């Protein structure tokens, strides 16, 4: 599928009124094809993990959007590694997304991994085509002390 | 004998919860309750789409009567015996 | 049989809500209730301009009696049977 | 018939409010109530300098009895019939 | 006739307050109450070191009975007649 | 005579506390209560794994009856006499 | 109406004691006429869209005011695009406004578009003739956890 | 009264051990007299107006104090202009004040002008002889959601 | 000329497709006419005066631009008051300007007032239709120590 | 007692292996004695007074600690001057203290001076041998709206 | 055990394809052995002690992690020194840790030392293999005024 | 001269249209008289002393101005104490000044005290009736390396 | 060599007085062995590339150090890709280094790749066992305008 | 000499009007004696080492002063370790100092250790009884490119 992408980018370079055979556009169908395969390669205490860098692709305009994910949770019996929370990020972010589904998908992946007391997921991101989306599940929604402990520590 | 129903802070609008995992499936059938697991919760619950005052009219016909109404958080809980 | 009226935190001053979309239009007519949809709300409601204690004197003459008063949030709710 | 008195969160100390603009001026006279408009409020109110339990002893001698005490916010409200 | 006792949010543990400045010194003597002025407060109060349920067993033997329990803030107040 | 049980804000799910350090060890034995000291607390307590409505069905068979339910904080407290 | 504006700006230049025929005021009735036509050319989770740049015209003194709009909402069934929330801004801002009506109009446009659970609209702006106006509709007004989640994330 | 002030400042310059007839103190009784006459020349949504610059005179030591006023209100039927709130400031600030009365006076002037739901007035200022004084009237005092909405937006 | 402006703004309100007789546009020809008359009412050591607030009118699009002027000079015999440097600002800024002429005009007014050793004028401003213009006259141009002393202290 | 201190500092200079008779340690027993006598020379609205500078002596290691006191109160009948709150600070800080007693002592001095509704005292300080101590008395402890109004305005 | 570590680091230098006998790797088995022995050498008012610097070793990858501990407590009868709270930190941090156990261990050590009303421990740290963990014990968990007083003062 | 000032301030209070016999203006002629007597009570390496707080009186309008002095010097044989440089500040600042003379006077006092290689004095201040004045004497004027070493370290 | 490292880390865990067979230290010899193999896996205009993140291993104490590299160069005939400058970084940083050799090695790799006019390499880094090292080669050393253009743009 | 200090601090506690036998002053002569013994326990590329924390004792008033040392040097043949530059700091700072001698002493210790091309030492510090002292030796004094490379990188 790598030659199938590279033929599709060479037809983009011709359709824009640009010369695909010049100094600077020889490996451009092939450098950009291996770019889009990288950009879609995903297919009792409170533990807040913040500043999680995110780089996803908009599924409407196929142009990236760049942001941060904030995750906090209250475990019951099973805790999760701080490097595994980031690979749950990279699986759902390195896809063709919207920010609204990307927030909800991360919360569901942590919910089913651990069955915790509560999950809070906050994704802020800049769409090049900031917006904050926020799921509050479990006891991050029912308790005011628990939601407000999350929201002060992430900043 | 006891039965705890609850709603949110605007009691004009539902949903009003009516039971837990071991609640009576005949009485939940008369109230018209569905059974869901909301996301992030680790338990099942019954619920109807009605306001709480309609349900308090239904439960009155099955021999219940409100002991005490109270509010905890944004929730408003009725206790029926 | 049950009837839930509510006000805000200063019960000296109104408005006090008196009903929902399916409330009795004869009894709302005696209380003097208007029916509005406030902005941002997705439901209709009845309301009067009186304090709640005046309305509790009115509803007493129509065969009601306060079971339980409770406060949920800034709201104060009366349950009348 | 109904009468709603209220205090703040320390019920050892007053003031306890006793009425609104259309409250009974004979019964407010026996309780010793003054009538003020506090700044920022757009309504009048009656109030005494006593704790609420002293006023509940006074209102008991005039044929009242507490139905329900509840707390809404920092306020604690008694309903007397 | 009325008597308002209160505790904090964990009612397993005390102290539970039992009276104000003009409370009955015989009945406070039976409950074992000390009288202090906590710092920042401009009033005196009675208090015991017991949980509230022990005091509710004591006050039952002196002809009282709980009308209404309610919670205001972190405080939980019992009204006894 | 008095007995104060409590749960958190979702009363569909437990645990519900049932007693303090000096509670009746026969009645705690019938309810199935364990006794723990949670960390940071300086007191012992009894607790069961059930919802509160199951415990209210149990305590009804031992000659209790709910006086008043109220909510203080995120906690919901039942008083049984 | 473009010659009707340009004749009205040439009468402004004469009334100010200024010479409308000099080096620097030849296209001034016509550059400013196409400026005022640009400046009035408008006639389960939480999604906060912040830093929305606004440039409106005061309807009292006909002098601009410059600010930011903060919008958050709780959807029920229908969500709205993050580029469509900004065009709802530009329709009501590129008019002759007051800030108080401009806040209320944005909240009503989102309320009727989606029928959400709640709407929060916050407009801060500097009037050259800062002031914060704020509508809280739905469950942003009744819930303290929901209003306070909005107000921490927008800053 | 302008010669009566200027004779009183010339007696100040003599009492300090200073020479009132030198290079630099000729117009000083008259420049300072017109300074003290300038410095005392004052005798459904939430609308927060912040950063209101204030320059008042201390009535104890007759030395200025410099600060900011934060005003927010919830209207009922009548709203007030954003330039009229600032002239209510300048009438009560350009006097001989204390900060504690200056806070309370601004809240009363807005209360009687509009009869709103609530008034919040916050004056921070540096006394050269910061201190924050704060009146919360109406439903800014009874509601916790309304006081906390005011206090997050002013900062 | 105040009725001559107000008739010219009433013809603007009609040409934009707007109703000049409604709630909110009754005093608008007269409030805006007295706005444009205010906005054009101007017709051995180093002393740097910075943060001088400026509010001028663009002469191309008749829309304001907002900025700061930084002035420093080396006197020879005659120094100038720190309140007189600001009125030299307000005379040339409260006109129909460009930023490039407004920089050069301020430097010439200080040059002829004092005949100093050198003059440095730096105007940064945001055009609503930042840009830094900078005149360096005298020994602010010939000396590298003198230009660099100016440019570090103004920031 | 000034010669009694100066003889005690001259025995310190000898005990450290240092030469008390050299260039730089001649007035050192007497300059430091008058330093330790200076360092121990102390023996309806909300009014928050913040940024109160504090310089106290640790009573354990006799080495200073440096901090800020934040005081707010709700008066009943009697208010207190903003220069008198600072002298209550300097009386209790210019002693041999701990931060924990220094917080509690300031709150008691204001409580007995005025009998107010509530007192809030917050001392942050750096111990050279930050830590925040905080007394909340009166209605700053019982009310959540009143404690949170204090804690947002002090920052 | 110091020669037993130094022989284990010399086998690391050989296994990486590196020359252990060169200019720069002669004392490297012995400088790093005394590094790992230093890095594991640990085996009525509110008093918040913040900015407590922490340097612990990850027990998974044996690579450090660097952070800050925030401790606050409400005493009953017994208070604890501000230098003893930091040695409780250094005993549990200078070990092979996880951040989640390091938070819980500090709270238990203060709980058993004093038996206070409540304990709040917040550890933020950067793992080189930020994350916030937070224990709230006692009346920092049951009271909303007490948890929120802690969380505003630590920032 | 203290009764001579207090009679001159009582004539100020009468001339402003204010009642000198009321609640709040009884000690005002005497509190302000002891304020103006305090405000005028002044009558081989590089050592930069910065952040020197200054509070002087304008001699034109008798209203304070508030600023900072930056002093650096290159000694030859005699150095000066860091507490004596600040008393040279307080002698010349606590007078009736202009900023331009206050800069030049501080440089001359240090020049005659030490005879150093060079003196650099920079006073920035806000006039309530910022401006930077700067004397560069000695080898701070002739050397570009020496002036630029001063100007980077003071910021 | 991966079992040879993992046996060397299991002897470290035993020598520290720690139990290598417990909950939390089972994969620790093998997780840390694959960590040290990752951490040592490296064996006419001005183009400044800044903020280049660096993570190297100290060769003295075998503990990381974390920093930033700033590279600028003046090409002659051959320019270099902005992703190739970063892989020159990662080859020399992911080794056992000192900061002083790591600076000099990056400058030599760019010098031999391009033969440019000048090379400037600046590495700031924090050693956990900031320090700035800086090579200036070519015409970044001989020209003062060229070195100072580099040093202002990197910040 | 530790009992000789502790007897000298017990005579300080008596001379201040303080009771040396109370709750809180029992170990105070002995805790402070071991404090003063800790506080005086010291008796081709550019390598800039900045942010070196310093804690010295003033020799005039025996009260600490707290600051930072910035050291840069150009080696000839011999370089110096980055942990040895900090122990040269701690030897000369943990004494009874002045800042002016402490700057000059650090430069001489590095000069004799290495004989480099140039030495630059900059000490900024706050005296509790900021000031910047700066020695520039070697080719940091003669070259303008070399002094200015030092002074931009340290900030
Ligand atoms: C019921 C409650 O939400 C839950 O048990 C807990 N909440 C919290 C917790 N820990 C912290 N830090 N914060 C909480 O809100 N541990 C337990
Ligand atoms: C009833 C409640 O206001 C509403 O259902 C929800 N609130 C919230 C929500 N999600 C977030 N993040 N915050 C809320 O306050 N989802 C649902
Ligand atoms: C009762 C309540 O305080 C009042 O009706 C309102 N409050 C608010 C409001 N709008 C905002 N933004 N915030 C409030 O707190 N509108 C109405
Ligand atoms: C010749 C020289 O430019 C001129 O004489 C002066 N320059 C300066 C000065 N003062 C300062 N601060 N800076 C200068 O550059 N005084 C005199
Ligand atoms: C009861 C209440 O705490 C007290 O009366 C008041 N509180 C407040 C007040 N003023 C302000 N700003 N904030 C308060 O919390 N005035 C009165
Ligand atoms: C019951 C309550 O939590 C406890 O008694 C106290 N809380 C507090 C206190 N002091 C402060 N500052 N804050 C509190 O929350 N002292 C006592
Ligand atoms: C001639 C020269 O200006 C003078 O000798 C010196 N200049 C300097 C100095 N020291 C510093 N830091 N900077 C100088 O510019 N010492 C001596
Ligand atoms: C000789 C000189 O150093 C060299 O030719 C150039 N220098 C520079 C350059 N471009 C920039 N921006 N800066 C220089 O210093 N181009 C060419
Ligand atoms: C002569 C000159 O000062 C000296 O040889 C060097 N200077 C410098 C240098 N390296 C840097 N980065 N900067 C210099 O100024 N290496 C050599
Ligand atoms: Zn897109
Ligand atoms: Zn306007
Ligand atoms: Zn004053
Ligand atoms: Zn323009
Ligand atoms: Zn100490
Ligand atoms: Zn790790
Ligand atoms: Zn002046
Ligand atoms: Zn190292
Ligand atoms: Zn000193």
Numbering used by the authors:
A (entry chain F), G (entry chain G), H (entry chain H), I (entry chain E), J (entry chain I), K (entry chain J), ...: 67 to 109, 127 to 212, 224 to 249
B (entry chain P), C (entry chain Q), D (entry chain R), E (entry chain S), F (entry chain T): 2 to 82
How do the authors describe this structure?
Structures of the inhibitory (EM_hGCH1-hGFRP+BH4) and the stimulatory (EM_hGCH1-hGFRP+Phe+active) hGCH1−hGFRP complexes were generated using single-particle cryo-EM. For the inhibitory complex, an hGCH1−hGFRP−BH4 ternary complex was produced by mixing the components (GCH1, GFRP, BH4) and purification via size exclusion chromatography (SEC). The inhibitory and stimulatory protein complexes were reconstructed applying D5 symmetry, yielding maps with resolution of 2.9 and 3.0 Å, respectively, which allowed building of atomic models. Comparison of the cryo-EM−derived inhibitory and stimulatory GCH1−GFRP complexes reveals a significant increase in the density of the EM map at the core of the GCH1 decamer involving the central five-helix bundle and the 20-stranded β-barrel (region C) as a result of allosteric ligands and GFRP binding. In the inhibitory complex, a high degree of flexibility is responsible for the apparent disorder. The loop does not seem to be held in place by any relevant interaction with the surrounding protein structure. Comparison of the inhibitory GCH1−GFRP−BH4 complex with allosterically inhibited GCH1 shows that binding of GFRP does not change the overall conformation of GCH1 significantly.
Guanosine triphosphate (GTP) cyclohydrolase I (GCH1) (EC:3.5.4.16) catalyzes the conversion of GTP to dihydroneopterin triphosphate (H2NTP). The effects of GFRP on GCH1 occur via formation of heteromeric protein complexes between GCH1 and GFRP, which are dependent on the intracellular concentrations of the effector molecules phenylalanine or BH4. GCH1−GFRP complexes consist of one GCH1 decamer flanked by two pentameric GFRP complexes.
